Amino acid sequence: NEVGYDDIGGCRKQMAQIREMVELPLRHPQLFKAIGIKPPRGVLMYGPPGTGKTLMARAVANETGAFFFLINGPEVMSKMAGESESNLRKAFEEAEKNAPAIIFIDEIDSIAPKRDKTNGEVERRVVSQLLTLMDGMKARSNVVVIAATNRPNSIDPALRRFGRFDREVDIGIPDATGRLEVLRIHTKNMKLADDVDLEALAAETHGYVGADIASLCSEAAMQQIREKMMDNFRFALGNSNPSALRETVVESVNVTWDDVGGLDEIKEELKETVEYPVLHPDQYTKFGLSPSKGVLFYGPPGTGKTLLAKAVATEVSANFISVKGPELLSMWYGESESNIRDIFDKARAAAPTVVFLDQLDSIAKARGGSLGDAGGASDRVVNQLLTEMDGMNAKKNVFVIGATNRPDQIDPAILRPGRLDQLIYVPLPDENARLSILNAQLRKTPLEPGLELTAIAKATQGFSGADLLYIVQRAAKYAIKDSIEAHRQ
């Protein structure tokens, strides 16, 4: 209804640069007269839908007192191509009559798609009306247009050229302190007790979009109502599903660097490559090239390869692209080299972001001039791998990890400084690393301190760490049976 500036946070660094983009040309239009140039007209926002894209425009509208015009995306484009061009003509004419005014539109990708091979849509007569309407009207008129969309790369490139939509903001998912701020906002009216937490409740979410905070609060409040005929927040996480459900942004395992033990020749050797350019890049611009992207992990089965995959992904709280081994789906002949490229461009958009792969080295088997071969896959997708891995940029500093279990079939062209070069053998856990791994896994178990795991490390000499995970699982599965035969009598 009547929202203000203090209702949302997280994007406060972007909220400050928005307040100089839509409020400064409206409240002080004479400042651009002194500098000579015209004030900007179009600023667009993007990101995941449900971070408050529609609530952000209504917050800055009520905090300025200006006119607030709204044209919906999938509403005015569903007409029969004749009333949409007059609705946009009525939109700019009414905003000029009652200046100062803002114009907020949402879902502009439904209005402005891209031109592709699947022609047959209308795709015209509406966006071209917006082109000839927006390039004028700059005769020091107090009007601005604000666009909003979900996918920022499905928009037509003619809009983001100059003078129509030139400034962009990236309101994404908040950090651990960002979800902590919106947790205090959405719980200002619920009479909670002193047993609830705020920092631990924000840190246990780690992937929750801001729309989920209103739903997770109402689910825990409804459970407290039902028990009349307040730690029900953990009950709400077990019942409700988090948003961005089946995407590549999964975070449900919250294993940190404390829960994984040993391998100190890998923990400090992963701190050297993927946390140094993403935190201190001032020394990397004068000491050669910045990024150390590729890193290889090889060893015995169950040596702890993917146990450290999500651990580094939650230390800097960046995104984690979990691509499996046979993800080259290969439905035809040409898309198998194309479905690996858009996930690399997505890593450049959400940079920095760790990418994972598994056993995709197949140029040693792609010999020249033979008969036994596939129809275009596993012999030409390595030719795409020889040109899409070193596609770097100084403004992104991405990094890609790689875990395998066979270091004998490494390609002679993939063991190169332009490719994944830093190969590190992941060894067996010795008698000192056996205690550091297993004690961090039974931290959740309310065990007795009489049983020390030094006898387990003396009984396990050539055992892997995953085999030691079966021992604490068997000790917990019989502690369940010890707890089953405790309440029945």
């Binding site: 091979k117 047959g120 439905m331 035809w332 002949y333 596939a374 129809g375 275009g376 896959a377």
Partner: protein, 48 residues
């Protein structure tokens, strides 16, 4: 280990915009449209 690729094609529409039958217009003339407030319309008599 092979593929099948085939594209498509469409035809959009044509229109005529034919309407207004004559029997609807003959009923459209013989009606009223309303008169403000005091715009009586009168009667008259004569020819005894």
């Amino acid at each position: 280990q092979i593929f099948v690729k085939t594209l498509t094609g469409k035809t959009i529409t044509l229109e005529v915009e034919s309407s207004d039958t004559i029997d609807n217009v003959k009923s459209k003339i013989q009606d009223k449209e309303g008169i403000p407030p005091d715009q009586q319309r009168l009667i008259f008599a004569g020819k005894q």
